[PDB]
Structure 1
């Protein structure tokens, strides 16, 4: 599923992502834009053999099991395919664990390079919330 901008903002707010660990909703919407272009089915392989899955591009090196990343962990206790669903609950719950692990949203390289320090409230402007 490819979400609309304000549709995804509403969905993230309903799952408690707004201001989670101090990050305002626009930070999450911006990160989803540059990680996946709002597409729940996005996948990308990394150089080390792991793969990033879903709207927030969660990495199988640490967070989910895809059957093909030797040596990795599964800290969210989930099959990576669950991160590709039209329903974002699994991605949101896993993102809450990731952003709590010490480095905040710098865990998402696209957020650091394209959202951090910018006018992220622009990403929820006009939305009915």
Structure 2
């Protein structure tokens, strides 16, 4: 599913990401834009052989099982394919664990390089929330 910007902002808000660990909703929308272009089916192989999955590009090195990432963890206890659903529940619940693990949203390289220190409130401008 390719979400609209405001559609994804509303779904992320419903699932409790607005100000989760102090990150405003615009941070999450900005992260999803530059990770996946708001596409739940987005997949991208990493150099280490792991893959990133879904609207927040969650990494099989640590968070999910994709059956092909050796000596990796599954800290969200999910098949990586659950992260490609039209329903972002699994991605949001796993993202909450990730952002709680000490580095906050720096875990998302596109957030650190493209969203951090910017006017992220622009990402929810116009949206009925």
If the length of structure 1 is used for normalisation, what is the TM-score?
1.00
Q: RMSD of aligned C-alpha atoms?
A: 0.2
Q: 1:118 offset after TM fit, Å?
A: 0.2
Give 1:97 shift: 0.1
Give 1:74 shift: 0.2
SS at match of 1:55: coil
The Cα of 1:72 is off from its aligned counterpart by 0.2
Distance 1:67 1:118 in 2: 37
Helix, strand or coil at the partner of 1:52 = strand
Aligned residues, how many? 129
Say which SS state the counterpart of residue 7 (structure 2) adopts.
helix
Cα separation, 1, equivalents of 2:23 and 2:48: 29
Per-residue CA deviations over 1:86-123 (Å, capped at 9, x if unaligned) read 00000000000000000000000000000000000000
Displaced runs of 4 or more, over 4 A = none
Unaligned runs of 5+ in 2: none
Matches of 2:33 and 2:70, distance apart in 1: 29
TM value normalised by structure 2: 1.00
Post-superposition CA distance 1:18-64 (Å, at most 9, x none): 00000000000000000000000000000110000000000000000
Structure 1: where are the runs of 5+ without partners? Answer: none
